[PDB]
Amino acid sequence: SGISLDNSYKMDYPEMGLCIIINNKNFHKSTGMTSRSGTDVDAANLRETFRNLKYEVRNKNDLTREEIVELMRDVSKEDHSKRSSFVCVLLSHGEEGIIFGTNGPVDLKKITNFFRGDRCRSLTGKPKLFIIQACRGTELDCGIETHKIPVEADFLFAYSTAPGYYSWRNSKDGSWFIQSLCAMLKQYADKLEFMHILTRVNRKVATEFESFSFDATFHAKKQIPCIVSMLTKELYFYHL
């Protein structure tokens, strides 16, 4: 045939793949962690957004750390041969490298390891996307007035906030990042490559949001999400 190019992930398998959404709102009292008001808005938006991208969406609410681990183990052991990609959305409390089950923390590394090129072979060479609405620390942004492929390859982490920083959630509108992510997927998924979509998300979050708090420490703060790509190809959600 004519000359071929290898710049873009094959996204025309029979299925787009799984979108696993882990929505942690209510935490065991013993943990001392607050309820995450507004997260259901996020979970609902995410479900609809990925539904229209033709992902097989599975929502799971209020999972323990043990339940998160076993869910990810089990999902990694499914046959993904007929699926183009894998998406996992985590919505919870967190710290750098860590997300919280209802009863305690899970290392992000433990979660993603199940999907390593060598440990989940039906996803080898396919984009594995991890979208994470969770704190990565306690810093606040004051803003300023204007043999073959690596086992860690083909992962993308779309973090809601910069390393070390709090991430902002609005109890009525949902989180800044998830709001903006869904809006930009809705508007551009049939147009832009995914990194270019994620860049629009960065700018929306950075420009359009600023915290209001009665507490001076947490008032007038800003947020910039953080795209971390080990993808080896461009990712378009559409095909021919």
């Binding site: 607050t34 995450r36 709090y166 902002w168 959630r169 609005n170 708090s213």
Partner: peptide
């Protein structure tokens, strides 16, 4: 507005 709250933090995660």
């Amino acid at each position: 507005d709250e933090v995660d």
